[PDB]
Write a protein of this length. Structure first.
Lengths: 32, 226, 225, 226, 225, 225, 32, 32, 32
């Protein structure tokens, strides 16, 4: 059969968690 | 086709009074075989057991146009009083006595406990007797404002088990067809209780299928011991 | 694009062309309208992003003065409210009630809870506030008795039901578009292929499933009839 | 092919009056078998059950060109008053009585409630009686401004269930073909109620297939007991 | 490349050559434009990059002076709006409104929300502004009354619909091109193989799907008819 | 290498030798020209790398003086522009307009947006600037009225459509090459095997696909006809 | 067969765990 | 056959361990 | 066949090990 109303949102949530992990390592450094 | 046309075409198809070996039948046997073919064909078509069509009661326009002239609708509000049922809230309604199969079936409810849902058109669900005990307390398959359980019993009766009072009983069934009697029969003889001439009431499309089925039935009748 | 183009794209992807089809275009409209909100929430709820202009719709409302509760003296000040119930906005876009001109006026669309307590600031005693009450109407509130003369507003937002807000669509120059199929569907093109894919996946399996086809007072699905 | 050509080709294919054993038919028998072959062939073509063609009513250009001459369009605004239906908002329309299968069926609506959409053409959906109860309330498959439910009932009627008033009822069906009668038949005889000569109204493309099937039916009729 | 080349490339890859085909070139046109927008957003929304001139497209607009709300003395200053509705733009490139010479003039094209509060700065009082209003037209506003005399402008941007902006395209030196199929499709050639692949994948499965062929007052899809 | 060698390599890899073949050499030219730009972008857009000399082409343009908008006095200074529309360059190479001698002269090819504002620097008032307008022509601009006498320039760049820029190819010593098949294809050899692989993969599947072959007023693809 | 009232909750819980892991790395830096 | 009275609790325990691992990395920083 | 008196204990022990690993990272910080 076929339906993506639950897999699409889980994939989107997985990629959102990856998004937050990626942007949580961003730092504007100091001590130049 | 008319009765004269049934007879003439039937004789032509059997090659009656031809030079080759053939079969000649009386108009009474023509009536008998035509009626038998008619009833067998329409039962097979309703049940979907005909291989040539392989289709159910209203599954295509072909079958619609075949059996459209047998479906009759019936209403009744009279309840048979003295009978024994499987529930206190069980009412009994008489069947028109010419029914073969019930295809649509509905009950209208008149109870003060229905609030503003009075006269709610409730579906009549035919239930087996295995399921009845466990369906009485079912809140999804048992009697309700939107459900009525019907059980067949003796004397052509319908036991409607409902939570609310049932005032009316709407139903649509396949009716008895008028038999195909090609000649007013003598005293004593009759087909389905009919003695005079009786024309087929179905559509002309299926008359020829009835004709060929009757021819095959006649051939089987005369050639089942040879 | 219009409702017609999306609907018939879905139908042609599914090849539901015969009039004797189980799944009618109404199923398509329902699925499209729901999956639109689904996709918009999935894309514009995680983190704040630019919402294009295609996702929005303008409804036009006619306001009527109503008592707070009833006609009593002490039942509080009166409110204006839209004559008809208003669609529910999603919380992803830029909702705005404007006085028939988007580039002018200040009518603030706020939450239901906030509008209980607004205008106590002396400099904010002349600002009209809006919210959708649990009644389903858009209620207006302010401390400046001039607001009660307001007669017409237009509300621009990413409404949660495209069908409802399109039915409440504002009159065009030519005139009203009677048929919903001839109105414009509220979604960006970059979200249209995913939307069609989701709807077509939703109805592909059901399209070829068996039916309870025999009229025999029996359930015929276990036998794959 | 004309009636004379039909008879002559029938005789030639049957090898009538040749030296080898053969079959000779009367023009009445030729007419009967030609009509039977015609109607069998077109019904099998419409249902798509012919193994030779294996195509439905309008599934290819060939079948279009075969049954193009039976497609008849019909319009009616009169409603039958006294009938018992399965819903309050049920209207009944007569069928032309020469219909074989309804292929297109649409209904125009006139009601105030659907304002500025008045005169909307509405798709008549033939619906079985199983689905009627659970389709009355269905907002996607039930009656609406763009969809009407038609149920077949007795006496060649069509019960249109609509949420709005139905003003006009349009049809395009397959008609009774005129029989293939090769001679003015004597008194009493007829095919499909027609006694005079009747030429096939279909295209000449299918006349030779009809002739072949009629010949095969003739041999079957003469050679079913030997 | 033109619309014809792309359309017929998709069709020939699908081998939809017979005129008796379920999927006509209009399906192809719709899918191509929607996947164009999809691909452009997928490529140029994550981070900022260079947009080539090929994804850009131009339209000709005729401006008419209109009231803000209606003709009244106190309803605010008038606006200039395009006579016809304007396609929605994609927020990925360099939208620009110019007075028929790209290398001259400063007519800023800003967000609709920003355009309310604009021009108060003393040095920004002679700058002409634009924003596609919820009505669908491109409204113009400025504090220097000379703007109302402006009669005709052009608008370059990466438009949401290639078809809508192609219909509104500027006249060429030779003249107008009557057929949409003879116009230049607005996408870079580096994005064309992905687009053709996506559209062909969209229509490959459906191309071989069963149809409800029989005319029998029945749904024939479950039987794979 | 020439267009002929690449085209016939693709055809022979596919074995499309019969004249009665669905996919003609025109499909091959289209796919080759698009996949060339695709590969060049994929290789020379991530990070800046040396671009060989094979990826470039020289077109020769004939310039004509044109008004900025029309013949009005106050419509600004006039521009030169190429007589015919110019191909769109990719942003990966070293575009350069030169006065028929690559090793001499300074004509700067800049972006459309930049050329609005150039030459205000007093030392840059004699530099000719170039850009492709949305009209599709190459427009020239400078503050030194001597530029308007310029009659011929040649433009060397990695053009986004090999077919267009090859059609505009500069006259050779022997003479013009009429047939495109006899001209030289613009790509480095290290990108040729990948290009052939991509095109052959693109057409391998479609090569053996079924056709709607029966002329019967019917779609015959669902039946794999 | 099919019923996803326990698969859905477990996938949602897995994504919640991964989200909490992602946001637990976030810091607002100092020493500029 | 089918029974989830042992797999459900093991999955729940796995997700509980993931929960505790995720929340054990949470820190409220100092030195601003 | 089937008997889960050793699979159950090993899965439970694995989850115990993973739980001990999780809780062993927990700290109550200092230096505010």
């Amino acid at each position: 059969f076929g339906s993506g109303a639950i897999g699409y949102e889980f994939d989107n949530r997985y990629l959102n968690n990856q998004e937050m992990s990626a942007v949580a390592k961003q730092r504007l450094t100091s001590l130049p | 086709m008319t009765n004269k046309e049934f007879s003439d075409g039937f004789s032509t198809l059997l090659n009656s009074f031809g030079i080759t070996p053939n079969i000649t039948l009386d108009e009474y046997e023509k009536s008998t075989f035509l009626t038998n073919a008619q009833e067998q064909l329409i039962i097979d078509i309703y049940s979907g057991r005909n291989i040539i069509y392989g289709k159910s009661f209203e599954q295509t326009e072909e079958i619609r146009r075949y059996l459209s002239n047998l479906v009759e609708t019936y209403e009744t509000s009279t309840k048979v009083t003295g009978k024994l049922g499987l529930s206190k809230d069980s009412v009994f309604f008489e069947i028109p006595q010419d029914t073969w199969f019930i295809t649509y079936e509905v009950a209208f409810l008149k109870d003060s406990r229905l609030g503003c849902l009075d006269g709610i058109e409730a579906s009549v669900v035919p239930l087996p007797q295995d399921d009845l005990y466990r369906a009485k307390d079912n809140p999804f398959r048992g009697p309700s404002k939107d459900r009525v359980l019907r059980l067949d019993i003796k004397s052509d009766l319908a036991e409607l088990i409902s939570k609310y009072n049932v005032d009316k009983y709407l139903m649509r069934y396949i009716s008895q067809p008028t038999p195909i009697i090609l000649v007013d029969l003598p005293d004593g003889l009759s087909i389905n209780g009919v003695s005079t001439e009786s024309e087929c009431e179905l559509n002309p499309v299926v008359h020829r299928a009835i004709l060929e089925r009757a021819v095959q039935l006649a051939i089987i009748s005369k050639t089942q011991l040879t | 694009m219009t409702y017609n183009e999306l609907i018939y794209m879905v139908l042609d992807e599914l090849k539901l062309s015969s009039d004797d089809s189980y799944y009618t275009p109404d199923h398509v409209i329902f699925l499209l309208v729901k999956y639109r909100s689904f996709l918009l929430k999935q894309r514009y709820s995680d983190i704040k992003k630019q919402i294009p202009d295609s996702d929005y719709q303008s409804i036009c409302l006619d306001l009527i003065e109503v008592p707070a509760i009833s006609g009593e003296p002490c039942e509080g000040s009166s409110y204006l409210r839209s004559k008809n119930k208003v669609p529910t906005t999603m919380m992803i876009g830029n909702p705005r009630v404007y006085p028939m001109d988007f580039y002018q006026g200040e009518i603030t669309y706020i939450s239901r809870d906030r509008m209980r307590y607004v205008g106590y600031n002396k400099f904010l005693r002349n600002i009209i506030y809006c919210s959708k009450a649990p009644d389903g109407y858009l209620y207006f509130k302010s401390w400046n008795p001039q607001f009660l003369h307001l007669e017409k507003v237009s509300f621009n937002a990413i409404f949660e039901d495209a069908k409802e807000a399109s039915e409440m669509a504002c009159p065009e120059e030519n005139g009203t578009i009677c048929k919903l199929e001839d109105k414009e569907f509220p979604i960006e093109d970059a979200l249209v292929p995913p939307l069609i894919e989701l709807v077509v996946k939703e109805l592909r399996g059901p399209e070829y499933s068996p039916k309870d086809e025999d009229n025999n007072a029996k359930d015929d699905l276990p036998d794959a009839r």
